[PDB]
Write a protein that holds these residues in place. Structure first.
Motif, PDB file in Angstrom:
ATOM      1  N   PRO A   1      61.840  58.149  -8.470  1.00 22.32           N
ATOM      2  CA  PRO A   1      62.547  58.149  -9.755  1.00 22.32           C
ATOM      3  C   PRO A   1      61.531  57.914 -10.824  1.00 22.32           C
ATOM      4  CG  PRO A   1      62.968  56.121  -8.620  1.00 22.32           C
ATOM      5  CD  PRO A   1      62.177  56.976  -7.659  1.00 22.32           C
TER       6      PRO A   1
ATOM      7  N   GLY B   1      64.588  57.708 -15.367  1.00 21.41           N
ATOM      8  CA  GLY B   1      65.736  58.583 -15.563  1.00 21.41           C
ATOM      9  C   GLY B   1      65.412  59.963 -16.093  1.00 21.41           C
ATOM     10  N   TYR B   2      64.149  60.333 -16.081  1.00 23.40           N
ATOM     11  CA  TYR B   2      63.759  61.639 -16.575  1.00 23.40           C
ATOM     12  C   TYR B   2      63.978  62.645 -15.473  1.00 23.40           C
ATOM     13  CZ  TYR B   2      61.976  60.165 -21.073  1.00 23.40           C
ATOM     14  OH  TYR B   2      61.881  59.657 -22.350  1.00 23.40           O
ATOM     15  N   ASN B   3      64.276  62.157 -14.285  1.00 28.35           N
ATOM     16  CA  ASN B   3      64.741  63.065 -13.261  1.00 28.35           C
ATOM     17  C   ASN B   3      66.044  62.526 -12.802  1.00 28.35           C
ATOM     18  OD1 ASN B   3      63.580  60.777 -12.295  1.00 28.35           O
ATOM     19  ND2 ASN B   3      62.357  61.812 -10.712  1.00 28.35           N
ATOM     20  N   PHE B   4      67.036  62.553 -13.657  1.00 24.05           N
ATOM     21  CA  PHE B   4      68.272  61.860 -13.337  1.00 24.05           C
ATOM     22  C   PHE B   4      69.145  62.572 -12.325  1.00 24.05           C
ATOM     23  CE2 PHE B   4      72.520  60.647 -14.828  1.00 24.05           C
ATOM     24  CZ  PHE B   4      72.402  59.308 -14.565  1.00 24.05           C
ATOM     25  N   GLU B   5      69.779  63.662 -12.716  1.00 23.54           N
ATOM     26  CA  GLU B   5      70.624  64.357 -11.768  1.00 23.54           C
ATOM     27  C   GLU B   5      69.975  65.681 -11.585  1.00 23.54           C
ATOM     28  OE1 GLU B   5      73.997  63.060 -10.191  1.00 23.54           O
ATOM     29  OE2 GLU B   5      75.231  63.461 -11.992  1.00 23.54           O
ATOM     30  N   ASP B   6      68.991  65.685 -10.682  1.00 29.16           N
ATOM     31  CA  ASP B   6      68.162  66.846 -10.340  1.00 29.16           C
ATOM     32  C   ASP B   6      67.166  67.251 -11.424  1.00 29.16           C
ATOM     33  OD1 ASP B   6      70.145  66.787  -8.271  1.00 29.16           O
ATOM     34  OD2 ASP B   6      71.336  68.242  -9.411  1.00 29.16           O
ATOM     35  N   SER B   7      67.158  66.500 -12.522  1.00 32.29           N
ATOM     36  CA  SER B   7      66.291  66.853 -13.623  1.00 32.29           C
ATOM     37  C   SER B   7      64.859  66.736 -13.189  1.00 32.29           C
ATOM     38  CB  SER B   7      66.557  65.944 -14.784  1.00 32.29           C
ATOM     39  OG  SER B   7      67.827  66.195 -15.294  1.00 32.29           O
TER      40      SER B   7
ATOM     41  N   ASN C   1      63.328  63.782  -8.236  1.00 36.18           N
ATOM     42  CA  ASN C   1      64.150  62.654  -7.855  1.00 36.18           C
ATOM     43  C   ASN C   1      64.504  62.635  -6.368  1.00 36.18           C
ATOM     44  OD1 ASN C   1      65.337  60.341  -8.836  1.00 36.18           O
ATOM     45  ND2 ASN C   1      67.383  61.299  -8.962  1.00 36.18           N
TER      46      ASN C   1
ATOM     47  N   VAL D   1      68.525  65.385 -19.609  1.00 37.34           N
ATOM     48  CA  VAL D   1      68.703  63.947 -19.776  1.00 37.34           C
ATOM     49  C   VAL D   1      68.085  63.387 -21.030  1.00 37.34           C
ATOM     50  CG1 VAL D   1      68.725  63.340 -17.357  1.00 37.34           C
ATOM     51  CG2 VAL D   1      66.540  63.585 -18.487  1.00 37.34           C
TER      52      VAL D   1
ATOM     53  N   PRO E   1      67.143  59.645 -21.250  1.00 36.04           N
ATOM     54  CA  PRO E   1      67.144  58.216 -20.822  1.00 36.04           C
ATOM     55  C   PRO E   1      66.900  57.251 -21.972  1.00 36.04           C
ATOM     56  CG  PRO E   1      65.143  59.308 -20.073  1.00 36.04           C
ATOM     57  CD  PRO E   1      66.014  60.387 -20.671  1.00 36.04           C
TER      58      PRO E   1
ATOM     59  N   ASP F   1      69.672  56.390 -10.010  1.00 34.93           N
ATOM     60  CA  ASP F   1      68.480  55.547 -10.237  1.00 34.93           C
ATOM     61  C   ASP F   1      68.817  54.179 -10.790  1.00 34.93           C
ATOM     62  OD1 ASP F   1      68.040  58.322 -10.814  1.00 34.93           O
ATOM     63  OD2 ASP F   1      65.897  57.795 -11.436  1.00 34.93           O
TER      64      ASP F   1
ATOM     65  N   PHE G   1      66.496  51.944 -14.639  1.00 37.74           N
ATOM     66  CA  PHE G   1      65.549  53.021 -14.434  1.00 37.74           C
ATOM     67  C   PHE G   1      64.158  52.456 -14.309  1.00 37.74           C
ATOM     68  CE2 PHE G   1      68.472  55.682 -17.076  1.00 37.74           C
ATOM     69  CZ  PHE G   1      68.832  56.481 -16.014  1.00 37.74           C
TER      70      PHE G   1
END
Ligand SMILES: [Mg+2]
Ligand SMILES: [Zn+2]
Ligand SMILES: [Zn+2]
Lengths: 277, 99, 79, 99, 50, 1362
Positions: free
Chosen positions: D10, D13-19, E5, F343, F345, F491, F615
């Motif tokens: 991780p 959160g810059y790769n949150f939901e497959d991002s 991720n 996203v 964040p 996350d 996160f």
RNA sequence: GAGU
DNA sequence: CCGCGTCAGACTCGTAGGATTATAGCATACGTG
DNA sequence: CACGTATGCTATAATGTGTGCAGTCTGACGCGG
């Protein structure tokens, strides 16, 4: 029971007896005299011929029933103009009238935009010529190739082929998918734009403000002559007659008022110049 | 893609669709119901009228927005008018009895 | 006020009427150029109105009061 | 496509939901950068009023705009263009309008 | 170069991507060993042996 | 412009002529050369108006200088071109023509009115046969069809004095001459003679038609068209495409056919043509008109050259592509944009990333306005060119405007209201929209390529609505269940889990730390792990009785990680909430707690904070997924080898011909299901607690520090089901049909499947994927129907002043308190207190909302059941009161009056279905049920308490159950209910009723696969109606000679054995019947279809022996595809296939007579002494045994209850609670929380109407069905005035019919069935005054709810005072 | 063809 | 009852334009610059 | 008069259609025998 229009009509025609030559002649003598019954019986006896002919001419022009009715109209002309004394058979004569009437009907009604007979027939000779050309050239012919064959202007050929451009329905959905039609894409070009409508308000209102900057006399002369704040674009004589006799003085005050507006523009025209796009 | 104001559709008068035709997004029945649930009445009415068909309303609203005052001046969607006319072309008398 | 409207809602009560009240007040500032109570601190009209309501300065009934007060004095001036 | 050094973890959160969080290096090396060839057409039609012309002579055009257009009114080969720039100049016979 | 991720693996049950990554790293590791040997210029013999 | 209401009535020929401004006599559209409209043609500008604004055709009159001038030369009025869309024309038909809608669209209307069969009418119309319009000679009566030769006979005989004609003329004349008044009275007189049930309905229908026809002022002549209206040009446009092409509406083609045919008819009449040709043309005319109005209705739709049917008028109103659905209930909208989402964040909860370029376009006019106030732009045109050039000053201006301005983000499908939320935009360079993580849940947005729409609220009102009502920060809680919808996921959960979780000693075990700041310092210095156990001094603020906060310092035992999280934690909350290891499930509770104590603002800040730290720690952890985490269990090979040999054992039993194919299939599934569980258990136990290798003192133990397990345990992502397929076992896949394959997938993903395992996987996978694509339509359609029927429901009042309400009890399905009385009742108004002297002295007064406080007190007091005020029981007419609803779950307080609750309800109920239809549709390839319904093992000690049970002691000494509704309770010391379990029919009990049982004791045991048919009496088995080939079959084997008797059903039966009912009759040694204990019922047990019988005829039996075994194939898949059709069948009020029978009225049960086994019932109450009879099928067995004191709605038969019958016997609370519970069963099985109050809303809408049985003081009379609101308001006026009271009975309606039954025909028509709805309304002359939301939205008005309620009540008081 |  | 008919069947996004045929040949008749 | 659009007449006998597709979906709810 049996609710097809076509089947019903064909059954009804079937139940009328076919005529022989001598019978047709006897009937028809009295029909030209105005026997009424004779005319009716000849028509009804010969409806079956109409259907045989309409069967041929149908194909793609119109509905079979439509062709049958127009054909009947031709048959009636034939019964009115038949000559019993001449040895020629009726069916032979009628065939000409029936084919004629059906063809003329399909030259008019078929096209959404009604094409005059002359144009239609011209266009058809262009077509038949194209067919001969295409057979021998192996290739479907250009506008100028057809024109060279007829020894005629290419503009003529082109205009005719443009008219042959057949219609597309606005409702036809696009892309083999029953998603949305042409109407869904097609704009109203004439209708601008809340942008454009609001710009006219702004324009018209800026002109009011500008007109009030000028003299009371100039502004009134401009307003009445332009038909701006007045109702009607009053001519020189009308404006002068209501104010100051001198028709010439209206022209003078008007042109004077335009030049004072030019001054305002050279000073504050920084807003006016931006009205040029 | 984004659009403030542009071309409008032919009969329905609401904005056209698709980015290539400079279109507006569809706010569908589903999307309408969302606003109704929340109770946002003016936003809803806004999307029904000044943002879509209402011709005089959209222009008046645009002028007001450029003049600051965010006033709502709503009217009646043209597509509704069309509907009445389509029903009358059906041979059904459908009349508005006014107040 | 800005992010969350909770204390503003607690003052008035009905969310929907809060919206109406603040909109009417914001329209006054927008059009009439009516004077703000709270310092704007570079905020938009809508935000001004909601602050005012939170602190309990603006009210539907209070707006109705100033409306009649000023309209009545206008009529007195006319006569 | 193109293979590359990937790590699974991780990241803020810059790769949150497959991002996907990708390194500037990939852009600098222009390896994912792509070529697109788009096709724009200018049609000169014959109208009821008369033929449309493809001339460079157009009302209200800047010299800057006409610099990249040749005598015919066609943009030169090699020329860089951006939205709004005229590619092929075309003019149409306009009818009367009640001013 | 990229950070993906890991929470998009167990739900998805696409484990091919992980195997691909491990094999991918080994593939590149051998590539770097060959690359190192080429930069040093050991000899044809040594490259051939490896 | 603005009107009150809208009326639909029949179009008179004269009325059509009024709208028309010209008669279109030519098909000519325009001229080929000068593309200008042709004279008296379809686009005639002389008729429909000028093509160009204030210009005549020939160009004589130009500009406003000539205003209302009508050119003498061309004949065109000089006005706005606008008028071309408004002005209508008309066509004079030579022969009359029927309106197809009032002919073909059933009910016939025209046929219904003449009482003439439809076929009959048509034979008349198409000129097959004549109809008698008036036979003055009573010899020949009216409307009597005569063939062509029949017309010839009476022609000479009677003639003159009988008038009989053919075609549309005949029917029109017949219609004209019928006098509705007189025949109404005549038919009413006949209704009194002997009104049979169906006769009375049809007669009452015509009566209501005739009555309504006179009330409408419509005349029957108008059913026939002489004038045909012509639609305006711009509504059937003929436009030139750029390419010189023309494009036209199909309507123009259809109209061209009509005109041609009509004008040919005029010609044929002028020529006095023979009648056969006149006939053909008249039929032709009718055909073309019918095609024009509704093409593919009557027969073959008239087609274009493309093959495709032309689009007629009705097609533009009808269906999805129709005006209503497509262009009126939904619209394309200005100030809208869309893009790909990604996203954000870094964003705070009330913000979103908005691309500069996008925002520049969206806010164009605001930029121009500000540019003019700055004096930067001189004019609008200059401002435009300034923004085109995109100047640096314009960026600063744009930044100025977007401040404090909300924008709406939307994601499709918009299932519930949170699919649209408002945010403050943050301008970003780059083309994608950035979305805040926490609201991803509400949108169901995941960034695998999702896109979103942006909308700009323009007005001050809309901006305020967005900021106040729609802002993300303000709308946290789901309106469906009272739960926070913004919950950390993925996350964020993972990081919080990582920090809070503990490890053995680790770095710096048993350190002592001053505050959490020292902790943070130490961790980041690298002198302590996040999992180090440590002593820490925390100061926790406990909120007092009042608003004041009391803080208190305490030394706690927690990890470094938990201390640091305490910094994010607000003061007010306790430390023990964070002191546990945190997961998704604990974090949701955390947020909720914070909301309830602190309030909105704190929770919003706290949510953002939690996101950031979540996160942050997630990343630091370095959490990853390699092939080694997927630990395998050494006992994998072993378990599998055993399982295979076990399956092989049953396969060998099958070849022997002992065990059936079905029995083996079931047992094999159970073997693999049990093996799959054990392997899963072994994988989890070998991965959950594998960290035995400890330290510190000596060899300690702890929880496994895997990456996978952590992900699953925390609830971030994955589950035990997923990991089975990674490391453990894949499981049993399911076919696209729903059944499970006998061979399951033994292997897993890490090991790698072979060709055949992969292939086998595909079936189930694809079935699932197809279900996503295909079934969501049906889910969504359900949503739509719900929404349509709940539309109108709004909070109208504060307090209805009712005492009414439903008594909610507790639910305990299985064991765990599925719906504790607390969870079911929270946030409801208490209708009525319950005074039980008790421990906390609780009255809790009337009209109190249940706060969490009062709910906690209920738990301490152990409240059994409570009367709660409900939507259904509200007395408010045209809506409900705030009290009867209770808390707006999305707000966390009492609902505000004005809120459109119905819409909320339907969205909330519909959404989950619609979403779960996509979810378990691709998240799994496999099926996992549980057929573990074997026995019942009690968990806690207590005494056994059976209710509604009827078993009989057998030979083995076991209490065999013979009741269908049997149930087992678990009563504690104080006599309180706790655990329960459904004990099936033919189940073996352990201990009698009341007997005590210890924990972990098996009290019940039965065989699920099979529904044995246990007896009651002992003796010998006798065969009745058991003929081989007729009702049963013969199936034997080899050696000795065993055979299996199977019962065929009418499906496999013969015409001869159809009325034959097979049963196993019980007799004694003498051959005499054996009566059932204490009754006059010969023991005869009727076997149903597919019933299997081991022991054949001539066999001794003892009380308790299984006679037959009814096989039971429930493939229960399941998921949702199965559930929602059950739910839809409920909301639509469809009666079940074999319904249970109920007692109508209280009294004493009396059994009577039998028609060859068919049971009659001669029942005789106490007060209503007159007998009541009811016929019952022979094979349907009654659970009760007659001669009994029966309440209204006591269940006689075994079977499902119909909601209608429940309403009719046990009233509203009964049926309401039935539907709520029966629906909730479905959603509960899928883990979907929906509040009962939503389903209650819908129920109430279903109970809108009531059939009046007996006359009032008004003109109600018998059998009219009117809205219950209106008849109760009438009864208030009756109470005041006395007079004859109106006796009524409320009726239940399914959702579709309830929506069609609303007085608003715009709502009805716009929903569905539009052709029929409009014929109904037009004939009735119905007027809609526009009360509902639908109606207003269609006319583009202000909604009567929410914001609009204030304005709408002001308008309503204007309406009431004139 | 793109998310549901 | 049976059988035949009519009515419904998620939401946004996309792509791209487009198809077919044939009506004789000539003399008089009606309307516009 | 001309130019554009229309109406008209022609004579071996010939005298009841077909033609191009539709592909069969589904669970429900009414409507004449
Ligand atoms: Mg997605
Ligand atoms: Zn004119
Ligand atoms: Zn109430």
């Amino acid at each position: 029971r049996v609710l097809d229009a076509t089947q019903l009509y064909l059954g009804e025609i079937g139940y009328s007896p076919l005529l022989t030559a001598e019978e047709e002649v006897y009937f028809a003598r009295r029909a030209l005299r105005g026997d009424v019954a004779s005319r009716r019986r000849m028509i009804e006896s010969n409806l079956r011929l109409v259907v045989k002919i309409a069967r041929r001419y149908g194909n793609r022009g119109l509905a079979l029933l439509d062709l049958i009715e127009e054909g009947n109209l031709g048959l009636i002309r034939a019964v009115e103009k038949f000559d019993p004394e001449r040895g020629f058979r009726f069916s032979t004569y009628a065939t000409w009238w029936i084919r004629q009437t059906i063809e003329r009907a399909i030259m008019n009604q078929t096209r959404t935009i009604r094409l005059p007979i002359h144009i239609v027939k011209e266009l058809n000779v262009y077509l038949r010529t194209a067919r001969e050309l295409s057979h021998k050239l192996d290739h479907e012919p250009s506008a100028e190739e057809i024109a060279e064959q007829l020894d005629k202007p290419v503009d003529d050929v082109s205009r005719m082929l443009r008219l042959n451009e057949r219609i597309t329905s606005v409702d036809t959905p696009l892309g083999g998918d029953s998603e949305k039609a042409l109407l869904d894409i097609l704009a109203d070009e004439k209708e601008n734009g809340p942008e454009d409508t609001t710009q006219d308000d702004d324009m018209k209102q800026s002109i009011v403000k500008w007109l009030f900057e000028l003299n009371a006399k100039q502004r009134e002369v401009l307003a009445r002559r332009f038909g701006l704040l007045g109702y009607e674009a009053a001519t020189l004589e009308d404006v002068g007659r209501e104010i100051g006799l001198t028709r010439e003085r209206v022209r003078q005050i008007q042109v004077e008022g335009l030049r004072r507006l030019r001054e305002i523009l050279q000073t504050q025209g920084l807003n006016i110049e931006a009205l040029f796009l | 893609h984004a659009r403030s104001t542009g071309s409008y559709s032919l009969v329905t008068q609401q904005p056209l669709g698709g980015k290539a035709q400079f279109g507006g997004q569809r706010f569908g029945e589903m999307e309408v119901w969302a606003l109704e649930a929340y109770g946002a009445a003016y936003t809803l009415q806004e999307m029904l009228t000044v943002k879509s068909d209402d011709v005089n309303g959209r222009t008046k609203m645009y002028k007001n927005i450029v003049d600051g005052n965010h006033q709502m001046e709503p009217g009646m969607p043209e597509s509704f008018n069309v509907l009445l006319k389509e029903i009358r072309s059906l041979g059904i008398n459908i009349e508005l009895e006014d107040e | 006020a800005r992010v969350t409207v909770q204390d503003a809602v607690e003052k008035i009560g009905n969310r929907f009427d809060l919206v109406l009240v603040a909109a009417r007040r914001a329209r006054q500032m927008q059009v009439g150029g009516k004077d703000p109570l709270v310092p704007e601190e570079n905020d938009k009209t809508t935000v001004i109105a909601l602050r005012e309501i939170e602190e309990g300065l603006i009210n539907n009934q209070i707006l109705d009061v100033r409306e009649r007060q000023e309209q009545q004095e206008q009529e007195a001036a006319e006569l | 496509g193109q293979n590359m050094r990937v790590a699974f973890m991780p990241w803020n959160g810059y790769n949150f939901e497959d991002s996907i969080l990708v390194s500037e290096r990939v852009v600098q090396e222009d390896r994912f950068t792509t070529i697109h060839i788009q096709e724009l057409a200018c049609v000169s039609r014959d109208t009821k009023l008369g033929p449309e012309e493809i001339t460079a002579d157009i009302p209200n055009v800047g010299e800057a705009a006409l610099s990249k257009l040749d005598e015919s009114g066609i943009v030169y080969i090699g020329a860089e263009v951006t939205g709004g720039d005229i590619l092929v100049g075309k003019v149409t016979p306009k009818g009367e309008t009640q001013l | 170069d990229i950070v993906l991720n890991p929470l998009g693996v167990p739900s998805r049950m696409n484990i091919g991507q992980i195997l691909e990554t491990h094999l991918g790293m080994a593939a590149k590791g051998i590539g770097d060993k060959i690359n190192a040997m080429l930069k040093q210029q050991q000899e044809v013999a040594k490259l051939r042996e490896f | 412009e603005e009107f009150d209401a809208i009326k639909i009535a029949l179009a008179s020929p004269d009325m059509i002529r009024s709208w028309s401004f010209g008669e279109v006599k030519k098909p000519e559209t325009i001229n080929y050369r000068t593309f200008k409209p042709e004279r008296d043609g379809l686009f005639c500008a002389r008729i429909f108006g000028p093509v160009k604004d204030y210009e005549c055709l020939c160009g004589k009159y130009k500009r406003l200088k000539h205003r209302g001038v009508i050119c003498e030369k061309c004949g065109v009025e000089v006005t706005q071109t606008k008028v071309r869309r408004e002005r209508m024309g008309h066509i004079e038909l030579a022969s009359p023509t029927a309106h197809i809608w009032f002919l073909k669209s059933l009910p016939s209307r025209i046929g219904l009115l003449l009482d003439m069969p439809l076929r009959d009418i048509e034979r008349v119309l198409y000129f097959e046969s004549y109809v008698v319009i008036e036979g003055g000679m009573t010899n020949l009566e009216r409307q009597q069809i005569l063939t062509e030769e029949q017309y010839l006979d009476a022609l000479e005989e009677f003639g003159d004095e009988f008038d009989a004609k053919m075609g549309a003329e005949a029917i029109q004349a017949l219609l004209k001459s019928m006098d509705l008044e007189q025949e109404c009275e005549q038919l009413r007189e006949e209704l009194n003679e002997t009104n049979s049930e169906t006769k009375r309905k049809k007669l009452t229908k015509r009566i209501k038609l005739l009555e309504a026809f006179v009330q409408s002022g419509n005349k029957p002549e108008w059913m026939i068209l002489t004038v045909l209206p012509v639609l305006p040009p711009d509504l059937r446009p003929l436009v030139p495409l750029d390419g010189g092409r023309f494009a036209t509406s199909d309507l123009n083609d259809l109209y061209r056919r009509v005109i041609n045919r009509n004008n040919r008819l005029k010609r044929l009449l002028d020529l006095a043509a023979p009648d056969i040709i006149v006939r053909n043309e008249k039929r032709m005319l009718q055909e073309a008109v019918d095609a024009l109005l509704d093409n593919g209705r009557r027969g073959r739709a008239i087609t274009g050259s493309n093959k495709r049917p032309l689009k007629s008028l009705a097609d533009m109103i009808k269906g999805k592509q129709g005006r209503f659905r497509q262009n009126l209930l939904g619209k394309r909208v200005d100030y809208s944009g869309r893009s790909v989402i990604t996203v954000g964040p870094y964003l705070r909860l009330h913000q979103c990333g908005l691309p500069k370029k996008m925002a520049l376009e969206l806010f164009k006019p605001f930029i121009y306005g500000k540019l003019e106030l700055r004096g930067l732009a001189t004019t609008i045109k200059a401002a435009k060119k300034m923004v085109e050039r995109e100047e640096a000053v314009v960026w600063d201006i744009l930044d100025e405007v977007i401040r404090e301005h909300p924008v709406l983000l939307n994601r499709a499908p918009t299932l519930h209201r949170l699919g649209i939320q408002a945010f403050e935009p943050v301008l970003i360079e780059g083309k994608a929209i950035q979305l805040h993580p926490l609201v991803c849940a509400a949108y169901n947005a995941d960034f695998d390529g999702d896109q979103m729409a942006v909308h700009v609220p323009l007005t001050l009102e809309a901006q305020l609505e967005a900021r106040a009502l729609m802002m993300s920060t303000n709308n946290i809680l789901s309106p469906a269940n009272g739960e926070p919808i913004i919950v950390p996921s993925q996350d964020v959960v993972l990081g919080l889990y990582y920090m809070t979780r503990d490890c053995v000693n680790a770095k710096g075990e048993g350190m002592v730390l001053t505050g959490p700041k020292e902790a943070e310092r130490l961790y980041r210095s690298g002198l302590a792990s996040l999992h180090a156990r440590v002593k820490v001094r925390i100061t926790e603020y406990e909120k007092d009785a009042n608003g004041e906060l009391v803080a208190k310092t305490s030394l706690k035992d927690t990890t470094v990680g938990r201390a640091i999280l305490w910094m994010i934690v607000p003061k007010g909350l306790p430390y023990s909430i964070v002191n546990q290891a945190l997961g998704k499930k604990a974090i949701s509770k955390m947020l909720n707690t914070c909301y309830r104590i602190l309030g909105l603002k704190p929770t919003v800040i706290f949510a953002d904070q939690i996101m950031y730290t979540g996160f942050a720690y997630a990343a630091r952890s370095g959490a990853s997924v390699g092939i080694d985490d997927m630990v395998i269990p050494e006992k994998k090979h072993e378990i599998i080898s055993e399982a295979e040999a076990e399956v092989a054992e049953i396969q060998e039993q099958f070849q022997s011909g002992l065990v059936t194919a079905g029995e083996r299939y079931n047992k094999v599934i159970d073997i693999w299901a049990a093996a799959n569980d054990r392997v899963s258990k072994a994988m989890m136990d070998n991965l959950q607690t594998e960290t035995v290798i400890n330290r510190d003192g000596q060899e300690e133990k702890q929880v496994s520090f895997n990456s996978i397990y952590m992900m699953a345990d925390s609830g971030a992502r994955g589950s035990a089901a997923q990991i089975r397929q990674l490391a453990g076992m894949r499981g049993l896949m399911a076919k696209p049909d729903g059944s499970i394959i006998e061979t399951p997938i033994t292997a897993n993903f890490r090991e790698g499947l072979n060709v055949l395992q992969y292939f086998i996987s595909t079936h189930g996978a694809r079935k699932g994927l197809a279900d996503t694509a295909l079934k969501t339509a049906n889910s969504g359609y359900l949503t739509r129907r719900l929404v349509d029927v709940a539309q109108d429901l709004v909070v109208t009042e504060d307090d209805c002043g009712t005492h009414e309400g439903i008594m909610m009890t507790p639910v305990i399905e299985g064991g765990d308190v599925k719906e504790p009385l607390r969870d079911r009742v929270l946030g409801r108004v208490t209708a009525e207190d319950v005074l039980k002297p008790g421990t906390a002295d609780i009255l809790v007064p009337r009209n109190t909302l249940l706060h969490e406080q009062w709910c906690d007190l209920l738990e301490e007091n152990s409240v059994d059941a409570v009367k709660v005020r409900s939507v259904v029981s509200c007395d408010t007419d045209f809506g409900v009161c705030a009290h009867c609803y209770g808390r707006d779950l999305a707000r966390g307080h009492i609902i505000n009056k004005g809120e459109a609750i119905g819409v909320i309800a339907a969205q909330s109920i519909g959404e989950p279905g619609t979403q779960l239809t996509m979810r378990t549709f691709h998240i799994g390839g496999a099926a996992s049920r549980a057929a573990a319904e074997s026995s019942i093992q009690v968990k806690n000690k207590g005494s056994i308490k059976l209710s509604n049970v009827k078993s009989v002691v057998n030979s083995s000494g076991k209490l065999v159950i013979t009741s269908r509704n049997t149930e087992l309770k678990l009563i504690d010391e104080f006599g309180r209910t706790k655990e329960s379990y459904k004990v099936p029919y033919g189940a073996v009990l352990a201990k009698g009723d009341g007997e005590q049982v210890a924990g972990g004791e098996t009290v019940a045991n039965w065989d699920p696969h099979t529904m044995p048919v246990i007896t009651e009496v002992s003796g010998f088995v006798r065969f009745t109606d058991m003929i081989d080939g007729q009702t049963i079959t013969r199936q034997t084997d080899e050696l000795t000679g065993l055979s299996s008797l199977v019962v065929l059903d009418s499906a496999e039966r013969t015409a001869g054995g159809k009325d034959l009912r097979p049963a196993l009759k019980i007799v004694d040694a003498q051959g005499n019947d054996v009566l059932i204990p204490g009754t006059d019922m010969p023991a005869q047990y009727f076997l149903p279809g597919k019933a299997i019988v081991q022991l054949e005829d001539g066999v001794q039996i003892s009380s308790g022996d299984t006679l037959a075994r009814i096989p039971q194939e429930s493939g229960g898949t399941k998921d949702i595809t199965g559930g929602l059709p059950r739910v839809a069948d409920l909301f639509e009020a469809r009666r079940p296939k074999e319904p249970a029978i109920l007692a109508e009225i209280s009294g004493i049960v009396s059994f009577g007579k039998e028609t060859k086994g068919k049971r009659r019932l001669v029942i005789t109450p106490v007060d209503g002494s007159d007998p009541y009879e009811e016929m019952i099928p022979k094979w349907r067995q009654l659970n009760v045994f007659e001669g009994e004191r029966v309440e209204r709605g006591d269940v006689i038969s075994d079977g499902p209850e119909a909601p209608h019958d429940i309403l009719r016997l046990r009233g509203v609370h009964a049926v309401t609670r039935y539907i709520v519970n029966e629906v909730q069963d479905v959603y509960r099985l899928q883990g979907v929380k929906i509040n009962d109050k939503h389903i209650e809303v819908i129920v109430r809408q279903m109970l809108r109407k009531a059939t009046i049985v007996n006359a009032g003081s008004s003109d109600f009379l018998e059998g009219e069905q009117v809205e219950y609101s209106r008849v109760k308001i009438a009864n208030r006026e009756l109470e005041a005035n006395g007079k004859v009271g109106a006796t009524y009975s409320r009726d239940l309606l399914g959702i579709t019919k309830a929506s069609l039954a609303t007085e608003s025909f715009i709502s009805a028509a716009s929903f569905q069935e539009t052709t029929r709805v409009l014929t109904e309304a037009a004939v009735a002359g119905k007027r809609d005054e526009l009360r509902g939301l639908k109606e207003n939205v269609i006319v583009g008005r202000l909604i009567p709810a929410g914001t609009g309620y204030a304005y709408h009540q002001d308008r309503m008081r204007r309406r009431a005072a004139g």
